[PDB]
Amino acid sequence: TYAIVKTGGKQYKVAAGDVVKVEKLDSEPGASVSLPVALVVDGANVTSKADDLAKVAVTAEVLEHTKGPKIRIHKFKNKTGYHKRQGHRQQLTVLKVTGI
Amino acid sequence: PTYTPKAGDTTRSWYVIDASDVVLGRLASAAATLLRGKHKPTFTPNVDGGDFVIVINADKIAVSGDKLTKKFAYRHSGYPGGLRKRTIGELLEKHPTRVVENAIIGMLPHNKLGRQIQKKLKVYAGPDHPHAAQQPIPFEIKQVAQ
Amino acid sequence: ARVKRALNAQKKRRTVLKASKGYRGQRSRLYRKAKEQQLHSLTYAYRDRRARKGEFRKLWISRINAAARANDITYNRLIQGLKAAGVEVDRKNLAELAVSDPAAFTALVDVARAALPEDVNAPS
Amino acid sequence: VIKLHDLKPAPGEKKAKTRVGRGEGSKGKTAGRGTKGTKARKNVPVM
Amino acid sequence: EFPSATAKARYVRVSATKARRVIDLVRGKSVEEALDILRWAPQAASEPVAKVIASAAANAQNNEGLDPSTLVVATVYADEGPTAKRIRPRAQGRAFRIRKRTSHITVIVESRPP
RNA sequence: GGUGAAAAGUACCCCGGGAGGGGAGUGAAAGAGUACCUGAAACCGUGCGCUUACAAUCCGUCAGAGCCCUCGACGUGUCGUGGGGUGAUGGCGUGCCUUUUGAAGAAUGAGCCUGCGAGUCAGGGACAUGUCGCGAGGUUAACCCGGGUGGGGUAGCCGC
RNA sequence: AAGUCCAAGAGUGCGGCAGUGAGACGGCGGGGGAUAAGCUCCGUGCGUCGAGAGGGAAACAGCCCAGAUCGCCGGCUAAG
RNA sequence: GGCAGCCAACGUGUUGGCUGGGUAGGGGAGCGUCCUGCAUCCGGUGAAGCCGCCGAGUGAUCGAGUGGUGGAGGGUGUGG
Ligand SMILES: [Mg+2]
Ligand SMILES: [Mg+2]
Ligand SMILES: [Mg+2]
Ligand SMILES: [Mg+2]
Ligand SMILES: [Mg+2]
Ligand SMILES: [Mg+2]
Ligand SMILES: [Mg+2]
Ligand SMILES: [Mg+2]
Ligand SMILES: [Mg+2]
Ligand SMILES: [Mg+2]
Ligand SMILES: [Mg+2]
Ligand SMILES: [Mg+2]
Ligand SMILES: [Mg+2]
Ligand SMILES: [Mg+2]
Ligand SMILES: [Mg+2]
Ligand SMILES: [Mg+2]
Ligand SMILES: [Mg+2]
Ligand SMILES: [Mg+2]
Ligand SMILES: [Mg+2]
Ligand SMILES: [Mg+2]
Ligand SMILES: [Mg+2]
Ligand SMILES: [Mg+2]
Ligand SMILES: [Mg+2]
Ligand SMILES: [Mg+2]
Ligand SMILES: [Mg+2]
Ligand SMILES: [Mg+2]
Ligand SMILES: [Mg+2]
Ligand SMILES: [Mg+2]
Ligand SMILES: [Mg+2]
Ligand SMILES: [Mg+2]
Ligand SMILES: [Mg+2]
Ligand SMILES: [Mg+2]
Ligand SMILES: [Mg+2]
Ligand SMILES: [Mg+2]
Ligand SMILES: [Mg+2]
Ligand SMILES: [Mg+2]
Ligand SMILES: [Mg+2]
Ligand SMILES: [Mg+2]
Ligand SMILES: [Mg+2]
Ligand SMILES: [Mg+2]
Ligand SMILES: [Mg+2]
Ligand SMILES: [Mg+2]
Ligand SMILES: [Mg+2]
Ligand SMILES: [Mg+2]
Ligand SMILES: [Mg+2]
Ligand SMILES: [Mg+2]
Ligand SMILES: [Mg+2]
Ligand SMILES: [Mg+2]
Ligand SMILES: [Mg+2]
Ligand SMILES: [Mg+2]
Ligand SMILES: [Mg+2]
Ligand SMILES: [Mg+2]
Ligand SMILES: [Mg+2]
Ligand SMILES: [Mg+2]
Ligand SMILES: [Mg+2]
Ligand SMILES: [Mg+2]
Ligand SMILES: [Mg+2]
Ligand SMILES: [Mg+2]
Known about the structure:
Distance between the termini of chain C: 85 Å
Oligomer: part of a larger assembly
Strand order of the largest sheet of chain B: 5-2-1-6
Largest sheet of chain B: 4 strands, parallel
Radius of gyration of chain C: 26 Å
Number of domains of chain C: 1
Number of helices of chain C: 5
Shape of chain C: rod-shaped
Keywords (chain B): Ribonucleoprotein, Ribosomal protein
GO molecular function (chain B): mRNA binding; structural constituent of ribosome
Organism (chain B): Mycolicibacterium smegmatis (strain ATCC 700084 / mc(2)155) (Mycobacterium smegmatis)
Structural class of chain B: alpha/beta
Number of strands of chain C: 0
Helix content of chain C: 55-70%
Number of domains of chain B: 1
Largest interface: A-C, 17 and 20 residues
Largest sheet of chain C: none
Strand content of chain B: 15-25%
Protein name (chain B): Large ribosomal subunit protein uL13
InterPro entries (chain B): Ribosomal_uL13 (IPR005822), Ribosomal_uL13_bac-type (IPR005823), Ribosomal_uL13_sf (IPR036899)
Helix content of chain B: 25-40%
Number of helices of chain B: 5
Order of helices and strands of chain C: HHHHH
Bound molecules: magnesium ion
């Protein structure tokens, strides 16, 4: 029992009881959110028609908000003296799916 | 995270292909595809995922055009002025297997993983082979229609 | 007031070498040789951070083409039929399914051929 | 309740002194003179 | 952990790698074989190393009261030390320098039951 | 230039001809023993984990199996919004600064480290830019009196 | 006369600040050259590099497509 | 999804529209070191320097965050 979920303009294959790292969305941690469906697989049969995809919904629980590993940006160009530094760190959220 | 092959999740199989009256380019391209393993959905470029392929009757290769006399296979031994010249006709007259071996090694990757894929190609001239113990599955090259 | 130079240079040089830990030869031991190829390494990181999406998409399509040819259909025909059917699933999920559920691909290729038109060479 | 602690200059009364030729981040390798020339070495007479 | 004793001789007038040549022949051997090898290896560095091994064996036998037949060399190593600095005249009156090298020697002995 | 609080500068025993060392004692410490506070980097090893002897390379990055160690839930190892060290194997990949239209350039400089090394300074000098007080007025120098930066000082200065 | 008119950050004047006055390539109109040079000298509200990251032509500044605020193991495309 | 500049409306800083490649060069805002002023504080129950681990900032970085050496001085803040 696994399904494909749309979030933040991204797609992910998630099964029941799994925790996924998706882009930050405005929601209080500990609450529940509803997401649309791109594909559901249940054993022998699958549902791919867009009508059933819109009909079915996926509910997940926002667990925490997290910042990713530090990534540092260096634009350096030879023989010209151009030397640039920049760091970056993205906020990410973890969701624990409950029911599909 | 995407899928990648594990240590022992890799699987091998044995295929035997007859080369009687088969076009050299098509046969060698299909063989190269099979050795790289683009036929399995578990392909991954940094690890070998293909199958062992055995070709029979290397002397029965058929090629189009007048290249039987106007195509040359080149190599140089190492000394200056040591360049030597032989044709495909002479090559099949002397060592029939060399033409198919060269054709396949030319399209496999020319890195060490490529020559590691090259390790698993068996090429013989005669109609028999001592690898009947591994029950290879005969393979006939086909084209998908669309 | 004379400010003699003890810690100022040392902090930055140590952070450079510490970030440059893990190289070979003079590379991980020597400063003047660290900063140069430290910057080269991070420039490579910048470039291949973009290159990684392309490489992954390449591998992804390769796996999908493999699965399609196993199911007796070409990649271009499969994608065109999928677009005609209006399925918005992406190559990530198709590749994971190809690794995972040939039943899922069997259903998907059936849908694609069903959505495929009568003649592919029609002027329409 | 103002102590010697509570003394601040006027906003914008303090402008930072420019350190020229103090690193390629801001001003490097040329010190605001550009490339080669007599202006890059000393000067030119006004007249 | 096992009982062990250490002994070293610094400021010895031999080159570091030149003493290390001999030292590489004694690592991990028993003390008897060590003494035999140092006696029978024709090198100048064989003398200081054999003296250090003999002294370490004496220290282990005396201070800690260990039986010499069971002692083995645990780790032995030579490190370069302060280098005496000299000058040598060479051709055309132009002068080059001579680096008079000096080495440290360290020996620690471990008693391993058979 | 720096032992230490003071020479209390290591009695005595042992290996060694001595140099040198190990204990025992001094001392808070001898990882403070006179080559003596703190002791880094270039430098020279030892021991441990991993890799490498079909392998063509500005030596790294992006993937990435395996091996070793570690942290929790679950038993003999298996996952988990895991880290750590190594990395076999594939994609990409032509050091840095100068001076140049043009450099990986087979153009210049650097063997390496530790420090030293470059728009600073004076004038009732001048201009323009922010800031502060008075205002048709704005103001002082030299100099006099207060162990003190304060008070006096209309000679001049700049627009009206 | 209209169009961007929560701005191109458009024009003109004045004031404070330095750089530049060694260009190169390609397409156009040309001179010299032998319609030779990767040649030289011009013109270009020409473009590019200089002062530009990416993909394509094997590599290759100047040709072709296209303007790198940062990140994503997402989709549609230009040249090819 | 996030940071940053310009602009418009309203407010006692939210919303909305654009822009953000850049050498010489111009403008704006900052980090760190030494030395002084003061309100004060830390430190033999271990300061500075030394060598790591974990974190956090868009940057020069920071941690009154801790581990092993060291045994005697330093710090916040606003200023110069
Ligand atoms: Mg250049
Ligand atoms: Mg510069
Ligand atoms: Mg490595
Ligand atoms: Mg010039
Ligand atoms: Mg210059
Ligand atoms: Mg000039
Ligand atoms: Mg002898
Ligand atoms: Mg005591
Ligand atoms: Mg010393
Ligand atoms: Mg000392
Ligand atoms: Mg190794
Ligand atoms: Mg091997
Ligand atoms: Mg090659
Ligand atoms: Mg390389
Ligand atoms: Mg590479
Ligand atoms: Mg390459
Ligand atoms: Mg420089
Ligand atoms: Mg030149
Ligand atoms: Mg140039
Ligand atoms: Mg030139
Ligand atoms: Mg060379
Ligand atoms: Mg030259
Ligand atoms: Mg030269
Ligand atoms: Mg050069
Ligand atoms: Mg020159
Ligand atoms: Mg040189
Ligand atoms: Mg020299
Ligand atoms: Mg002046
Ligand atoms: Mg003024
Ligand atoms: Mg006065
Ligand atoms: Mg605007
Ligand atoms: Mg002007
Ligand atoms: Mg100027
Ligand atoms: Mg000129
Ligand atoms: Mg000119
Ligand atoms: Mg010109
Ligand atoms: Mg020209
Ligand atoms: Mg020209
Ligand atoms: Mg022309
Ligand atoms: Mg003409
Ligand atoms: Mg010329
Ligand atoms: Mg032109
Ligand atoms: Mg230039
Ligand atoms: Mg370009
Ligand atoms: Mg441009
Ligand atoms: Mg390119
Ligand atoms: Mg942009
Ligand atoms: Mg706004
Ligand atoms: Mg910018
Ligand atoms: Mg500049
Ligand atoms: Mg204390
Ligand atoms: Mg303590
Ligand atoms: Mg502390
Ligand atoms: Mg101390
Ligand atoms: Mg201090
Ligand atoms: Mg501070
Ligand atoms: Mg202050
Ligand atoms: Mg200040």
